[PDB]
Amino acid sequence: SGFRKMAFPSGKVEGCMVQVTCGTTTLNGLWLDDVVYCPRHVICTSEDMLNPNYEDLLIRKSNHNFLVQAGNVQLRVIGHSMQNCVLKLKVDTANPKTPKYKFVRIQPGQTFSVLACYNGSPSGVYQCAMRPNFTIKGSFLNGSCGSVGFNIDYDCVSFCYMHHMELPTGVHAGTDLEGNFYGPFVDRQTAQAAGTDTTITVNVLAWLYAAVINGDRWFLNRFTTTLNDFNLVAMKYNYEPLTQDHVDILGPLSAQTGIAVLDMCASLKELLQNGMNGRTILGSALLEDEFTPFDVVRQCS
Amino acid sequence: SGFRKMAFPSGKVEGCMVQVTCGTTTLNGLWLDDVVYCPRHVICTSEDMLNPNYEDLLIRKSNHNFLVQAGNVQLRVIGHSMQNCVLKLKVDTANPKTPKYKFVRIQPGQTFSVLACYNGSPSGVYQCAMRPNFTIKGSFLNGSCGSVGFNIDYDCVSFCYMHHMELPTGVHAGTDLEGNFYGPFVDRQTAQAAGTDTTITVNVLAWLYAAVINGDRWFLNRFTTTLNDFNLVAMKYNYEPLTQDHVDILGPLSAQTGIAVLDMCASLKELLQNGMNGRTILGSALLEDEFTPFDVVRQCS
């Protein structure tokens, strides 16, 4: 029993982290088979970041301008290309520690682990959610660029995220491993608006189910409610709309606890309308939304 | 910028996890050089756990009664011994993935990473604190016994914790890697009292310093206070007494923020006496105590 925000074991990803340098800039890259992937802004100076023409800046670079270091080993670059906002450096050796992997583009509200890295060396691991507005609230100090987010299915690593930048607001933005940004962001140091962020309703409900399984039941109510009634309450509190697809994903958890989803929505409604009166749920004084239904099921199982 | 509860990268520990079976019971072991370490209650049935005589139960066992499996590999046991509450199985091969390691016994209020494992295979990693009452609030399902807690100093892994049991209260208890329990607990399925748990004051202060560095300053006050005045407030709120050793450890953080420790205690006092008025600090509605001063410094650096 008990409930912690758990990350995937990071070992399979640690063996893929490398350091990439172009000119003066050093950041993290991901070495898989004979390709190294890193943020294309590695080729920019701090002055370039105001308004970079990446194609033009990349033109000034040849294979020998890219220093790729894996531990103490030096890799030889035999090709370079830009794919969207990522650089792909073809190297002459396959990474012997390449795990089974896929590149996936995750959906807002899904969770993943981040291995935060500096100069190609891992420093820490944490679990987070992609926010509905396609930002992440991470821990990214200078030189963490190129650190990656991932999920693990027994032996396959699904890479879903590469860190690129901190917005002026302090939240973080990045790409999938094909270099397409999540959300409206660009790799340019300019003012950039993230949308209003909403709370991930299906995750909150999943976590409430986690709480019941673990013995916290005070929030359970006499009331029930309807999908439209609840969504009225959600819209007011900047919770994302709950759909029947969400209700269905919560099915196994409803089965385990014997609590119907709409009964649990009515508890959430009262929570939203009345607050927590200084009480806690699973040790938290706020409604937690970075556990998916899948996360809760896997941790309990 | 930004602040997350970060665990150490788990790779060095993943390569040490094995599965140990004696009779019907299977749990996790730690394979380092040519020794496997696991909880001695691996040799107990569920009936044995009421009141086990470990010496007598161990007598009925010989080397070939202990099945040690590392992935698909099978290890050969050439010796067994009981050290306090841990069994040490001498095997015929050194673990080739043995990192540089030490065994350390940590102090209450210090933090470490846990690799939660089931049948010798890792499932998740999280960061936690040893509570002042020598329990941990973990995530330990059936078969997590023998999962280990650790810190990492660049390349050395310092093992500090092995999980043994869940108390009837839902909190967890375990040993150092010499088999000495943290706290008053025994490896017996009987009612066991944990002391009153207190909040780790020096960690809360460290986290407040983290908050200032990250831009949350609302809690900063006009007041200051004294060590004895503050400790009056701490005792009332079940916070552990703050000493000059603690004030000193907070020195680097006081230097970075230009805020004297006692000024920050006065902010904490007002927080403790007035609550948070529905506000948050670093995204939390409660005062967080599982970051040490060292944790905060390392993450900011």
Dihedral sign, CA of B202, B203, B208, B209? Answer: positive
Dihedral sign, CA of B208, B214, B218, B221? Answer: positive
- Single-letter amino acid code for the residue at A162: M
- Window A:109-148, CB contacts with B under 8 Å: 115-116, 122-126, 128, 137-141
Residues listed for chain B: 301
State the Cα–Cα distance between residues B22 and B24, nearest whole angstrom: 6
Cα angle value A55/A57/A61 (rounded, 5°): 105
Q: Rounded to the nearest 5°, which phi and psi values hold at A54?
A: -65, -40
Q: Which of B8, B14, B166 sits opposite A1 (nearest CB)?
A: B166
- Please check whether residue B155 touches A, CB under 8 A: no
State the Cα–Cα distance between residues B254 and B26, nearest whole angstrom: 49
Cα angle value A78/A83/A89 (rounded, 5°): 20
Dihedral sign, CA of A232, A237, A241, A247? Answer: negative
**Cβ atoms of residues A16 and A31 within 8 Å:** yes
A271: tokens are 């929570």
Instruction: Kindly determine whether residue B4 and residue A139, on different chains, have CB atoms separated by under 8 Å.
Output: yes
- How many C-beta neighbours within 10 Å does residue B209 have? 24
Pick the closest to residue A280 from B288, B234, B271 (CA basis): B288
Which element (helix H / strand E) includes B241? none
Which element (helix H / strand E) includes A101? strand A100-103
State the Cα–Cα distance between residues A221 and A267, nearest whole angstrom: 5
Residue found by looking up tokens 């140990």 in the block: B20
- Please check whether residue A280 touches B, CB under 8 A: yes
State the Cα–Cα distance between residues A123 and A195, nearest whole angstrom: 30
A65: tokens are 């301008």
**Cβ atoms of residues B27 and B146 within 8 Å:** yes
Which element (helix H / strand E) includes A48? none
Instruction: Kindly determine whether residue B7 and residue A126, on different chains, have CB atoms separated by under 8 Å.
Output: yes
Helices (H), chain B: 11-14, 54-59, 201-213, 227-236, 244-249, 251-257, 261-274, 293-300
Cβ contacts of residue A243 below 8 Å, gap of 6+?
A: none
State the Cα–Cα distance between residues A28 and A31, nearest whole angstrom: 10
Q: Rounded to the nearest 5°, which phi and psi values hold at A63?
A: -45, -40
**Cβ atoms of residues B262 and B225 within 8 Å:** yes
State the Cα–Cα distance between residues A268 and A204, nearest whole angstrom: 9
The partner residues of B18 in beta bridges, in order of sequence, read B29
Instruction: Kindly determine whether residue A139 and residue B3, on different chains, have CB atoms separated by under 8 Å.
Output: yes
Determined by X-ray
State the Cα–Cα distance between residues A260 and A247, nearest whole angstrom: 9
The partner residues of B77 in beta bridges, in order of sequence, read B91
Q: Which of B125, B127, B140, B296 to mutate to test the interface with A (most CBs of A within 10 A)?
A: B125
> What are the CA-CA distances from residue A202 to residues A5, A197, A238, A291 (Å)?
17, 15, 13, 9
The partner residues of B19 in beta bridges, in order of sequence, read B28, B69
- Cα Rg of chain A (Å, integer): 22
Chain B residues with CB-CB distance to A299 below 8 A: 124, 139, 141
Cα angle value B246/A141/B245 (rounded, 5°): 5
Dihedral sign, CA of A255, A261, A267, A271? Answer: positive
**Cβ atoms of residues A164 and A149 within 8 Å:** no
> What are the CA-CA distances from residue B268 to residues A115, A298, B231 (Å)?
32, 38, 11
Dihedral sign, CA of B197, B202, B207, B212? Answer: positive
Which element (helix H / strand E) includes A57? helix A54-59
Please report the DSSP string for B189-218 in residue order.
Answer: SS--PPPPP-B-HHHHHHHHHHHHHTT--T
State the Cα–Cα distance between residues B6 and A28, nearest whole angstrom: 18
- Chain B residue nearest residue A142, CA to CA: B1
